[PDB]
Enzyme design. Structure first.
Site, PDB file in Angstrom:
ATOM      1  N   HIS A  34     -20.470  41.744 -53.252  1.00  0.00           N
ATOM      2  CA  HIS A  34     -19.934  41.766 -51.871  1.00  0.00           C
ATOM      3  C   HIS A  34     -20.197  43.152 -51.297  1.00  0.00           C
ATOM      4  CE1 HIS A  34     -16.937  41.061 -48.568  1.00  0.00           C
ATOM      5  NE2 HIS A  34     -16.541  42.314 -48.869  1.00  0.00           N
ATOM      6  N   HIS A  67     -18.661  25.564 -45.734  1.00  0.00           N
ATOM      7  CA  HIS A  67     -19.681  26.608 -46.008  1.00  0.00           C
ATOM      8  C   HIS A  67     -19.426  27.191 -47.407  1.00  0.00           C
ATOM      9  CE1 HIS A  67     -21.058  30.825 -45.804  1.00  0.00           C
ATOM     10  NE2 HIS A  67     -21.965  30.459 -44.876  1.00  0.00           N
ATOM     11  N   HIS A  68     -18.226  27.732 -47.638  1.00  0.00           N
ATOM     12  CA  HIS A  68     -17.766  28.255 -48.950  1.00  0.00           C
ATOM     13  C   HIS A  68     -16.272  27.954 -49.113  1.00  0.00           C
ATOM     14  CE1 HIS A  68     -16.605  32.345 -47.082  1.00  0.00           C
ATOM     15  NE2 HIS A  68     -15.497  31.884 -47.688  1.00  0.00           N
ATOM     16  N   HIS A 120     -13.974  28.059 -45.696  1.00  0.00           N
ATOM     17  CA  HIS A 120     -14.817  28.514 -44.565  1.00  0.00           C
ATOM     18  C   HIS A 120     -15.507  27.292 -43.961  1.00  0.00           C
ATOM     19  CE1 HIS A 120     -18.296  31.016 -42.789  1.00  0.00           C
ATOM     20  NE2 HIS A 120     -17.199  31.282 -42.077  1.00  0.00           N
ATOM     21  N   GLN A 134      -8.875  28.856 -49.942  1.00  0.00           N
ATOM     22  CA  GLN A 134      -9.455  29.373 -48.685  1.00  0.00           C
ATOM     23  C   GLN A 134     -10.766  28.636 -48.442  1.00  0.00           C
ATOM     24  OE1 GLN A 134     -11.048  33.613 -48.418  1.00  0.00           O
ATOM     25  NE2 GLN A 134      -9.555  33.468 -46.754  1.00  0.00           N
ATOM     26  N   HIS A 178     -20.976  44.602 -46.897  1.00  0.00           N
ATOM     27  CA  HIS A 178     -21.025  44.195 -45.462  1.00  0.00           C
ATOM     28  C   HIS A 178     -22.477  44.302 -44.977  1.00  0.00           C
ATOM     29  CE1 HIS A 178     -16.535  45.423 -45.609  1.00  0.00           C
ATOM     30  NE2 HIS A 178     -16.669  44.134 -45.965  1.00  0.00           N
ATOM     31  N   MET A 189     -18.252  48.251 -48.157  1.00  0.00           N
ATOM     32  CA  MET A 189     -17.642  47.949 -49.472  1.00  0.00           C
ATOM     33  C   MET A 189     -18.791  47.655 -50.435  1.00  0.00           C
ATOM     34  SD  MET A 189     -14.387  45.531 -48.386  1.00  0.00           S
ATOM     35  CE  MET A 189     -13.100  45.735 -49.617  1.00  0.00           C
TER      36      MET A 189
HETATM   37 CU   LIG Z   1     -18.438  30.949 -45.807  1.00  0.00          CU
HETATM   38 CU   LIG Z   2     -15.697  43.750 -47.697  1.00  0.00          CU
END
Ligand SMILES: [Cu+2]
Ligand SMILES: [Cu+2]
Ligand SMILES: [Cu+2]
EC number: 1.14.17.3
Length: 309
Positions: free
Chosen positions: A198, A63-64, A128, A126, A200, A269
């Protein structure tokens, strides 16, 4: 991409350059929405420059992907779950790949300075994994990033400018709350070439400008409810002594039965990452703005910043 085997991840290209193949060591995720991490130790004890990224993502399943510089990865294993997180120390984002999103490239002459006394000693990848319908056990995934390092001092050094609101409060319902961030830029010139927003689940739109003699020049506008890649800047913007960086995250209360600034997805955030370069003689690798130094200036913020896309 197909799984590496015995070939080894570090590839010397000459006395200056080497390539790193940072890949999951053949992993098979069992749940939907799994976050796998691993880390590579830089193979030189000295200042190196990261001058290219090539993503090696399975279009099927990843995904990412995020690449980070730090000195202390969370875990020591060959791979580990990182809902926990990435690095114990500050994680310096280098590279963000998302499935369907323009793939930004480093401008000619640009490097991320790593290693030496001060730079990162470790890359943490990392990944996803999203829909695990491909992972009918039927495969082990080796997704990741190729990275070109040189010991040759690059003429342009990349850095990260983070702008985050830290005193914001959203009462429930209140259809619109603005998190405004603003700082006066006091350093030598930076050339903004990419941004990442970014928020939420509440934030509706995030916008970043340079303001000079009262003129608002857009750096980026994004729906933060999308894959959080670094998007490429529509016109590379210089930022200069005397300029103001201004940002606004626009939030809804609708949906909440009780919000503040925190790490919980129950919390919010307002973050804008501006990836930039400077002349090497002037370069700083990180800057932050957590203040709002010019609140009466948002009075002439462009209409576009108050509306979705
Ligand atoms: Cu992702
Ligand atoms: Cu956040
Ligand atoms: Cu310019």
């Amino acid at each position: 991409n197909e799984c590496l085997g015995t070939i080894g991840p570090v590839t010397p290209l000459d006395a200056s350059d080497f390539a790193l193949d940072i890949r999951m060591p053949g992993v098979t995720p069992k749940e939907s929405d799994t976050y796998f991490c691993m880390s590579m130790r830089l193979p030189v004890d000295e200042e190196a420059f990261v001058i290219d990224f090539k993503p090696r993502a399975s279009m099927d399943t990843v995904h990412h992907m995020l690449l980070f510089g730090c000195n202390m990865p969370s875990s020591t294993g060959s791979y580990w779950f990182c809902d926990e997180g990435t690095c114990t120390d500050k994680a310096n984002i280098l590279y963000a790949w998302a499935r369907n999103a323009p793939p930004t490239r480093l401008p000619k002459g640009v490097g991320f300075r790593v290693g030496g006394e001060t730079g990162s000693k470790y890359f943490v990848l990392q990944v996803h994994y999203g829909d695990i319908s491909a992972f009918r056990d039927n495969h082990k995934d080796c997704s990741g990033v190729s990275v070109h390092l040189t010991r040759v001092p690059q003429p342009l050094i990349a850095g990260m400018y983070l702008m985050m609101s830290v005193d914001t409060v959203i009462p429930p319902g209140e259809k619109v709350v603005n998190a405004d961030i603003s700082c006066q830029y006091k350093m030598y010139p930076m050339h903004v070439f990419a941004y990442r927003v970014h928020t939420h689940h509440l934030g509706k739109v995030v916008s970043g400008y340079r303001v000079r003699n009262g003129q608002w020049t857009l750096i980026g506008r994004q729906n933060p409810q999308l894959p959080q890649a670094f998007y490429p800047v529509e016109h590379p913007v210089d930022v200069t002594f005397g300029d103001i960086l201004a940002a606004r995250c626009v939030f809804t209360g609708e949906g909440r039965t009780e919000t503040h600034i925190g790490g919980t997805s129950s919390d919010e955030m307002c973050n804008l990452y501006i990836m930039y370069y400077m002349e090497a003689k002037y370069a700083l690798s990180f800057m932050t703005c957590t203040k709002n130094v010019a609140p009466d200036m948002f009075r002439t913020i462009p209409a576009e910043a108050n509306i979705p896309i």
